[PDB]
Design brief:
Chain B: This is Bromodomain-containing protein 4. Chain B: Belongs to the BET family. Chain B: It is found in: Nucleus; Chromosome. The complex is a heterodimer of chains A (4) and B (128). By secondary structure, chain A is largely without helices or strands. Chain A has no helix or strand. By secondary structure, chain B is an all-alpha fold. Chain B has one domain: Histone Acetyltransferase, Chain A (Up-down Bundle). Helices cover 50% and strands 0% of the residues of chain B. The chains are: A little secondary structure (4), B mainly alpha (128). At the A-B interface, loops of A face loops of B.
Chain lengths: 4, 128
């Protein structure tokens, strides 16, 4: 996934 | 990220800043922070955002007024505040920063929203  | 650093964190003591211990600040620490701190979704917000570790080199390009509950807790414990509004504003800075940096629906944004819901429930009952 990800926080940018 | 290579020579990447985090800014120094926000101050949690300032000897030349006027301080008070109000009934509302005691409740902010006793009720509102102990409640949010224990929450299942508190963990991203219990310390400053570690942009180095999380590999988020634009974090502190976008967020210029960082705030976290680790900071708020130390401030409440060290009686940093003059009044409850100063403290509530730090909480709102932390939630807004998250909504600014991230995008609706992101896990982090759901965590912040759960915590903010809870925040507000508890702050409704702030004694005058």
């Amino acid at each position: 996934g990800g926080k940018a | 990220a290579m020579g990447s650093t985090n800014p120094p964190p926000p101050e949690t003591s300032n000897p030349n800043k006027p301080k008070r211990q109000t009934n509302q600040l005691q409740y902010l620490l006793r009720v509102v922070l102990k409640t949010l701190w224990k929450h299942q979704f508190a963990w991203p917000f219990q310390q400053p955002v570690d942009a180095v570790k999380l590999n988020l080199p634009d974090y502190y390009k976008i967020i210029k007024t960082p705030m976290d509950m680790g900071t708020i807790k130390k401030r409440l414990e060290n009686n940093y505040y003059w009044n409850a509004q100063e403290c509530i504003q730090d909480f709102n800075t932390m939630f807004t920063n998250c909504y600014i940096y991230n995008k609706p629906g992101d896990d982090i944004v759901l965590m912040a929203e759960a915590l903010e819901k809870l925040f507000l429930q508890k702050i409704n009952e702030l004694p005058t």
